[PDB]
Amino acid sequence: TPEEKLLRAIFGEKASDVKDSSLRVPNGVSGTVIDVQVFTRDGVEKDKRA
Amino acid sequence: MGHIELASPTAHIWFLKSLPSRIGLLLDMPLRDIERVLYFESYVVIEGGM
Amino acid sequence: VPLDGGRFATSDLNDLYRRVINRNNRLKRLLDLAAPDIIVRNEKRMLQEAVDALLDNGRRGRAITGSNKRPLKSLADMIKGKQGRFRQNLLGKRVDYSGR
Amino acid sequence: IGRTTDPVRMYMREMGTVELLTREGEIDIAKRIEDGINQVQCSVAEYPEAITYLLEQYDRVEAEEARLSDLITGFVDDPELAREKFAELRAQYVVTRDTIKATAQEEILKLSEVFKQFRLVPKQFDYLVNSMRVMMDRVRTQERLIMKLCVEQCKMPKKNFITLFTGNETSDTWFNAAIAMNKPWSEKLHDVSEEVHRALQKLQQIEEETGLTIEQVKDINRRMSIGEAKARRAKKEMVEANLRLVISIAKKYTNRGLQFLDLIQEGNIGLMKAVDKFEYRRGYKFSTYATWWIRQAITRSIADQARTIRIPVHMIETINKLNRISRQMLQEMGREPTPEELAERMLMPEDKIRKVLKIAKEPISMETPIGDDEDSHLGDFIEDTTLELPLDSATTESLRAATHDVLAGLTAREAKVLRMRFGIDMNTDYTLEEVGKQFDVTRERIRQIEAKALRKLRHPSRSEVLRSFLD
Numbered sequence: 065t066p067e068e069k070l071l072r073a074i075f076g077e078k079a080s081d082v083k084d085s086s087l088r089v090p091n092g093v094s095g096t097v098i099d100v101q102v103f104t105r106d107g108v109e110k111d112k113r114a
Numbered sequence: 115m116g117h118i119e120l121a122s123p124t125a126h127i128w129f130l131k132s133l134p135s136r137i138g139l140l141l142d143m144p145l146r147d148i149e150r151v152l153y154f155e156s157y158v159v160i161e162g163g164m
Numbered sequence: 165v166p167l168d169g170g171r172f173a174t175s176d177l178n179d180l181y182r183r184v185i186n187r188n189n190r191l192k193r194l195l196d197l198a199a200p201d202i203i204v205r206n207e208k209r210m211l212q213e214a215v216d217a218l219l220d221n222g223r224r225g226r227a228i229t230g231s232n233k234r235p236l237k238s239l240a241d242m243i244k245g246k247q248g249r250f251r252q253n254l255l256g257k258r259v260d261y262s263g264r
Numbered sequence: 265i266g267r268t269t270d271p272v273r274m275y276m277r278e279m280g281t282v283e284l285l286t287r288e289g290e291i292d293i294a295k296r297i298e299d300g301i302n303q304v305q306c307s308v309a310e311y312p313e314a315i316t317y318l319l320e321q322y323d324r325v326e327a328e329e330a331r332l333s334d335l336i337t338g339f340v341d342d343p344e345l346a347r348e349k350f351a352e353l354r355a356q357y358v359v360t361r362d363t364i365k366a367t368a369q370e371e372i373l374k375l376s377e378v379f380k381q382f383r384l385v386p387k388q389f390d391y392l393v394n395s396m397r398v399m400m401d402r403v404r405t406q407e408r409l410i411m412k413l414c415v416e417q418c419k420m421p422k423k424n425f426i427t428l429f430t431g432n433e434t435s436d437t438w439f440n441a442a443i444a445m446n447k448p449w450s451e452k453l454h455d456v457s458e459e460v461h462r463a464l465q466k467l468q469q470i471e472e473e474t475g476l477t478i479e480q481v482k483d484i485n486r487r488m489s490i491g492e493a494k495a496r497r498a499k500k501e502m503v504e505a506n507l508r509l510v511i512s513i514a515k516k517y518t519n520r521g522l523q524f525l526d527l528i529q530e531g532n533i534g535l536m537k538a539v540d541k542f543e544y545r546r547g548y549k550f551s552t553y554a555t556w557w558i559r560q561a562i563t564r565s566i567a568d569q570a571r572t573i574r575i576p577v578h579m580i581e582t583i584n585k586l587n588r589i590s591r592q593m594l595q596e597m598g599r600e601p602t603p604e605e606l607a608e609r610m611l612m613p614e615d616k617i618r619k620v621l622k623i624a625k626e627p628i629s630m631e632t633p634i635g636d637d638e639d640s641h642l643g644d645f646i647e648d649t650t651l652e653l654p655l656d657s658a659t660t661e662s663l664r665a666a667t668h669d670v671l672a673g674l675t676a677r678e679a680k681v682l683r684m685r686f687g688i689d690m691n692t693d694y695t696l697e698e699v700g701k702q703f704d705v706t707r708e709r710i711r712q713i714e715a716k717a718l719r720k721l722r723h724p725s726r727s728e729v730l731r732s733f734l735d
Binding site: 165167170171172173174175176178179182183186187190193194197198199200202203205206207209210213224225227229230231232234236237247 | 269270271274275278279496500503504507519521523525526529530532533536569572573622625626627628629630631632633639642643646
């Protein structure tokens, strides 16, 4: 919107091309992560943790 | 809303099959005959002149 | 609506409208071709069937849907009945600022 | 008939009534078609000015502004031969128009017999038939209105109309002879004598350009209608006979996304196409030829109008090949084929393999019942993602307030510059040149003012209200 345009002009705030989607813990549940599993399709580069 | 142009004038099921068939009694003709006509089982003589 | 996972979800009215339009266009073509009476009569019957299935599906051979064996829901089904409307969504809403 | 509403059953009865024509009946009806088309062919040859357009567009084709195959698709008992025959056609026609004043009847017959060898791509048949039909329409409306003028007011018998108007159709003798009959409506005819006679003149103009008269134009065109209708009736009988073949082929493609009757209707259309294009000169049974169309039509219809989200026909063929290959690989390998194994067996790079695998999914119905619960469907879960969250609306309002206050904090003309350079409280924002036009001073100084105002907004304690909206 215009007004945000002006704010960016003044402060020079480079807009991030990425939205957040991270899987955060549900509200009001708290415990210890005991196990993690990672499934990559065949072809894709396994990450270090994988 | 949009609309569709029908090639053949089509009957409105509500005004035909509703238990008191209002097309039927408006024309004072029993339902069996009207069904017979719409499904192309018999003709009807509309103003057969002299 | 496109469901997460590349699949799509559609109301049955899309199917019913599509079928009506298909049979209508085919009847147009058949008329332009001057086909024998038997064929145009069959097509006119089919268009009757499609329309009356659209308005209130269930007062005929109950045109079931594609590969799902459940009879698809027509407009009359949307209005009438408990699950459909007046009862469900216009006297039975779901408020905000509420807890349990 | 037990009032069976099922449309399948009544269509089946109507079909069941027409009995199966035997082996030779088929050849008979095919001869019927040839004879009707031949009759109309002679009739079209017998009409004039058609050759005019033939010659004209063949000449057009010689100049190379068109194609040689747009008029003929091979003759029966090379462009050069056609060119010479069209030259002799021009010559014979013009000389017969000169010799019109008896012998010209024989000369037109010779023109027709020399033209007989040619055939004509359907589109031109359509053009000529529509031209003569529209001429007949026009003549028929004029004649019918004249005949109305006579009978509706005078109760005029009809042999007299025939003799007076029919026979000449060219001289004005009958118009004024009708008035000589002392009849009162004939005396009133002077009111529309102008129009009647001007339409007669138009009739003479069409006649002369065609180079004939009317009564025989009526005769020829009505014979054309007789021949064409006869042939059509024969074709009707044929197709009614072969509807059974249509159903037989149709029963194969069962519930594959198309209502049974849609299939049989598409098959009927394909059978019509086959019948109209069939050539018996081979000898082999029509059914063999018609099938190759019935299956074609059914497959095409399934290809296009089956899926909700339509997919091109070549893509459907690709998916079917996919399924086939998969089937074979499963039965050989035992386990299943992975996309790599398919990319082996098929030549695509496996990128298009996963593309094709994604494409095929049909949309799921939003009414499908959710697990073990018949009062909660799927539609009740999908949410509306477009809707802006109320938080964001409150934020936008607060920001509008803050920017209004900070703009008021600036000077008048600086504030107007900053408002117009952007769109605050206005439509599209004007560039430096247009804002200069608004001030009528158009140059870089104005960009200096915008930047200077911005610099002034850098100053702390004034911008903090806007610093807050960052996050």
